[PDB]
Amino acid sequence: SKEYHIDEEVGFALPNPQENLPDFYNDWMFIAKHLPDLIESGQLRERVEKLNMLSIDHLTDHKSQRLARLVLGCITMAYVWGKGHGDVRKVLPRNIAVPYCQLSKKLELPPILVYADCVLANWKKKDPNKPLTYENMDVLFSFRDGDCSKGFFLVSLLVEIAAASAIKVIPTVFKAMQMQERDTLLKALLEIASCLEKALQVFHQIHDHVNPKAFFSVLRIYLSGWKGNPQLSDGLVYEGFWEDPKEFAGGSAGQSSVFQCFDVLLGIQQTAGGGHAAQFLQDMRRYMPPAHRNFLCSLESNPSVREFVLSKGDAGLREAYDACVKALVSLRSYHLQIVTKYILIPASQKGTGGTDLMNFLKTVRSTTEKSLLK
Amino acid sequence: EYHIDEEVGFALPNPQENLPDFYNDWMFIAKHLPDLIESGQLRERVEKLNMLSIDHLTDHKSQRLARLVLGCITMAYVWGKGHGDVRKVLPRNIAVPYCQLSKKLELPPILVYADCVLANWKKKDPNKPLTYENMDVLFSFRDGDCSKGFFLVSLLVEIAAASAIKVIPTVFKAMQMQERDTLLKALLEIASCLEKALQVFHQIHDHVNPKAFFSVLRIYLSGWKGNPQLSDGLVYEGFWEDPKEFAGGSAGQSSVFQCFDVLLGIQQTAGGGHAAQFLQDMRRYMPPAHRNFLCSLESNPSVREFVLSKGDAGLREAYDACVKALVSLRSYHLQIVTKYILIPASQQAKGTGGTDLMNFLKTVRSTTEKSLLKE
Ligand code: HEM
Numbered sequence: 001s002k003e004y005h006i007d008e009e010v011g012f013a014l015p016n017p018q019e020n021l022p023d024f025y026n027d028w029m030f031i032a033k034h035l036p037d038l039i040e041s042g043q044l045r046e047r048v049e050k051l052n053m054l055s056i057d058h059l060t061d062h063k064s065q066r067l068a069r070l071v072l073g074c075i076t077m078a079y080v081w082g083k084g085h086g087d088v089r090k091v092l093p094r095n096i097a098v099p100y101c102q103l104s105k106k107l108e109l110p111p112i113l114v115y116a117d118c119v120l121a122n123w124k125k126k127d128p129n130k131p132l133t134y135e136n137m138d139v140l141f142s143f144r145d146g147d148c149s150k151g152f153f154l155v156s157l158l159v160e161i162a163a164a165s166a167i168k169v170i171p172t173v174f175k176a177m178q179m180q181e182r183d184t185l186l187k188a189l190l191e192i193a194s195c196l197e198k199a200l201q202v203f204h205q206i207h208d209h210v211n212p213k214a215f216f217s218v219l220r221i222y223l224s225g226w227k228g229n230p231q232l233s234d235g236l237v238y239e240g241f242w243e244d245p246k247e248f249a250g251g252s253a254g255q256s257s258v259f260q261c262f263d264v265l266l267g268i269q270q271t272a273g274g275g276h277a278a279q280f281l282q283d284m285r286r287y288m289p290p291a292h293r294n295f296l297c298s299l300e301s302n303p304s305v306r307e308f309v310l311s312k313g314d315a316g317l318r319e320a321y322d323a324c325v326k327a328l329v330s331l332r333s334y335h336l337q338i339v340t341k342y343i344l345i346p347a348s349q350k351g352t353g354g355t356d357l358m359n360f361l362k363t364v365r366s367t368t369e370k371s372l373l374k
Numbered sequence: 375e376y377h378i379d380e381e382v383g384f385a386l387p388n389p390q391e392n393l394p395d396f397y398n399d400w401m402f403i404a405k406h407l408p409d410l411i412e413s414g415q416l417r418e419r420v421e422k423l424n425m426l427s428i429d430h431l432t433d434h435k436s437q438r439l440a441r442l443v444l445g446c447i448t449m450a451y452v453w454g455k456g457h458g459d460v461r462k463v464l465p466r467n468i469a470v471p472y473c474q475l476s477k478k479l480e481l482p483p484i485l486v487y488a489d490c491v492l493a494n495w496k497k498k499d500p501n502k503p504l505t506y507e508n509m510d511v512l513f514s515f516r517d518g519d520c521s522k523g524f525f526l527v528s529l530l531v532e533i534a535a536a537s538a539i540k541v542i543p544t545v546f547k548a549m550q551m552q553e554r555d556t557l558l559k560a561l562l563e564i565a566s567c568l569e570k571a572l573q574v575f576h577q578i579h580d581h582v583n584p585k586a587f588f589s590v591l592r593i594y595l596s597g598w599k600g601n602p603q604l605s606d607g608l609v610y611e612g613f614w615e616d617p618k619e620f621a622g623g624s625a626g627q628s629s630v631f632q633c634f635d636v637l638l639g640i641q642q643t644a645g646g647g648h649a650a651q652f653l654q655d656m657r658r659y660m661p662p663a664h665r666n667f668l669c670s671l672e673s674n675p676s677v678r679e680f681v682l683s684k685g686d687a688g689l690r691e692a693y694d695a696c697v698k699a700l701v702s703l704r705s706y707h708l709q710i711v712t713k714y715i716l717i718p719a720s721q722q723a724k725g726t727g728g729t730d731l732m733n734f735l736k737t738v739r740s741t742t743e744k745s746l747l748k749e
């Protein structure tokens with residue numbers, strides 16, 4: 001789907017992301033590529049302040065604007081959070097802020113690092129002639145040595161890639177409903193269920209490549225934002241763009257379009273009600289690439305798959321729909337065990353998005369389980 | 375597919391006036407809200423109701439009427455006489471069928487604009503046109519609350535806007551087909567329809583008085599979200615266990631102004647500000663098909679950007695006439711807000727929707743005025 005920017009094999013992930021920016025931005029690229037060293041040495045904040053306000057006009061293609069976004073995004077996190085020990089910058093300099101906020105308005109994304117930057121556009125394959133496995137992949141940017149950003153960003157991307165198998169069959173579901181093709185629909189539903197069951201084994205890889213201490217005490221600090229954050233009470237000031245401090249949420253997979261589009265497809269109203277969970281997931285759509293929030297829109301505008309399956313007294317169609325729902329609760333249940341190991345236990349010795357964490361995740365999982373027909 | 379009517383726009387065409395005889399007990403209370411409240415009989419009559427199933431509400435129109443009936447009863451039950459003696463728990467016999475019908479229609483279990491304006495009307499004579507004299511509301515809260523005047527004038531503005539909404543596809547097609555002259559003619563036609571909506575808004579003064587709005591109607595239209603009177607929200611007994619929060623009714627829930635702001639690229643919902651957050655949140659208080667419509671206009675190429683890139687004074691002037699008609703509507707609205715809210719409040723504060731009134735309204739008007747290409 002070139003209209004919604006959905007790839008056949010990588011789904012919502014930006015296929016083959018650009019590694020190098022035009023030579024005119026070698027100054028931005030030097031900093032971004034040297035964050036572990038410039039942060040640890042205390043040279044980072046001074047290298048950002050010494051920068052000259054570069055124009056965003058030399059970024060022509062979409063892949064170059066997305067890489068620049070990832071570059072300026074990682075530098076903004078590093079600048080604001082420093083060494084990640086509580087000494088924060090409340091103001092972002094104009095020579096970095098002005099081109100960052102301009103590029104953000106151009107790509108319709110807020111001026112903060114989002115999941116679409118650090119995960120969907122933060123990757124490469126080692127050997128282009130080899131498959132999309134963890135051993136054949138790497139990330140473009142990290143924050144600090146030992147932060148486990150490779151394992152963390154890649155495991156997220158791999159889940160995203162595993163979801164692409166199910167994403168491509170969505171139009172088969174909608175065409176079968178209108179054309180009233182029950183057998184085609186049942187087959188499409190079983191196929192979605194199959195794919196979501198396979199994505200659960202991809203989640204298992206987090207244990208192998210991410211250590212709980214490094215995620216909690218380091219990576220989570222850098223991915224955090226300035227909305228409801230006591231550290232930056234009124235938000236961040238983007239010098240030369242807005243005279244007032246703007247609040248933006250930190251990165252999260254709540255910004256992933258995958259789980260949101262399966263909730264929409266299956267008629268799981270996660271966005272329904274006035275709860276905090278429904279509120280966050282709705283707000284995170286404005287942190288997604290515009291083409292992806294437009295895709296979510298278009299899926300919502302279609303007639304309900306849940307209502308169609310219910311309007312028929314067909315046990316076979318009901319079992320296939322439930323197989324898709326059961327696969328989602330199983331993903332969300334395993335995910336709760338991850339958050340216990342990576343956030344709750346290390347905290348005993350808040351996440352990157354800023355939610356109530358456990359209550360938020362339990363409310364979203366509870367809603368999914370309640371969609372079960374049997 | 376977007377439940378947009380050619381003549382009434384976002385309003386529900388010819389709403390149902392009566393429910394099947396099975397719900398007569400709901401209808402009696404809803405139809406006699408002024409009398410039952412005044413006599414202190416409302417809360418008792420509600421508590422004596424049997425729990426009725428929603429299965430006898432078959433068609434969309436009968437489901438929309440039932441939502442209006444249960445929504446009015448709920449506001450009456452929670453607010454009572456309108457002086458502070460509040461109810462924090464809504465009985466199961468009403469709360470259960472109300473949330474079921476609400477879940478089915480994808481609307482929160484609180485009276486919204488789509489109920490009390492869009493589905494709360496009729497024509498006296500079906501052969502005569504849609505004029506105030508040929509129309510009436512179906513439900514009221516109190517004797518002298520001016521609810522007929524209030525709801526009907528909002529509806530009449532909503533209907534005046536219907537004429538501009540039907541030319542939206544012409545605008546997008548003209549852009550796609552690169553038909554400069556068609557686009558210009560379509561933009562001037564939207565502007566003309568928006569200018570006529572302002573003349574309809576003037577009728578407010580003859581059918582609504584400030585004391586009745588501020589001290590009565592405003593009380594019943596209010597909700598339980600950030601409200602000190604129901605700090606935790608409302609308990610929907612037998613449906614949810616915890617109290618839930620929902621904002622009160624407002625024309626922030628109207629899809630009219632929201633769709634013209636999206637059409638013209640007036641970034642009202644963009645950013646994390648109070649005004650933007652409120653207008654985005656009110657989309658989940660709109661019927662699903664109307665929230666889908668807004669969302670789908672956002673996915674279309676920018677009318678603003680198309681106009682800005684052509685170096686065509688004629689096109690810019692037609693675009694600016696559309697923006698100007700919205701600033702004119704919002705500037706008139708600030709005078710209505712002084713007459714119906716600021717003056718009565720000083721003779722003794724929020725509106726029904728719960729925003730920080732003056733800031734919110736000035737931020738929305740400012741964002742519209744700043745969209746003008748030329749002053
Ligand atoms: C180190 C491992 C992980 C931890 C500690 C973790 C933590 C969290 C937390 C705290 C939230 C709540 C939002 C917030 O306030 O930040 C969340 C939401 C979410 N996470 Fe994870 N997560 C991890 C890995 C993953 C992976 C690998 C994916 C796969 C793409 C993922 C997908 C999601 C989704 C979709 C949500 C939104 C809630 C839902 O739809 O159920 N997470 N995660």
Ligand code: HEM
Nearest residue numbers: 527528531624625626631711714725726727728729731738
């Ligand atoms: C007695 C008459 C009226 C009063 C006192 C009044 C008051 C208000 C207030 C207080 C708000 C802010 C939202 C809130 O906190 O509640 C508001 C918003 C709004 N009102 Fe009015 N209003 C009145 C009549 C109308 C009418 C007839 C229309 C036309 C349909 C209208 C259209 C709007 C719109 C579109 C908004 C959203 C803000 C915007 O887009 O500018 N209002 N109104």
Ligand SMILES: O=C1C[C@H](c2c[nH]c3ccc(F)cc23)C(=O)N1
Nearest residue numbers: 156223251252253254351352353
């Ligand atoms: O605390 C967390 C981690 C988790 C998450 C999973 N994949 C991510 C990619 C980027 C990012 F900033 C956060 C995440 C989340 O949603 N909250």
Ligand SMILES: O=C1C[C@H](c2c[nH]c3ccc(F)cc23)C(=O)N1
Nearest residue numbers: 528595623624625626725726727
């Ligand atoms: O306080 C107010 C009144 C005004 C308004 C205009 N038409 C309405 C229809 C229903 C409703 F509950 C409120 C309104 C608004 O947006 N805030």
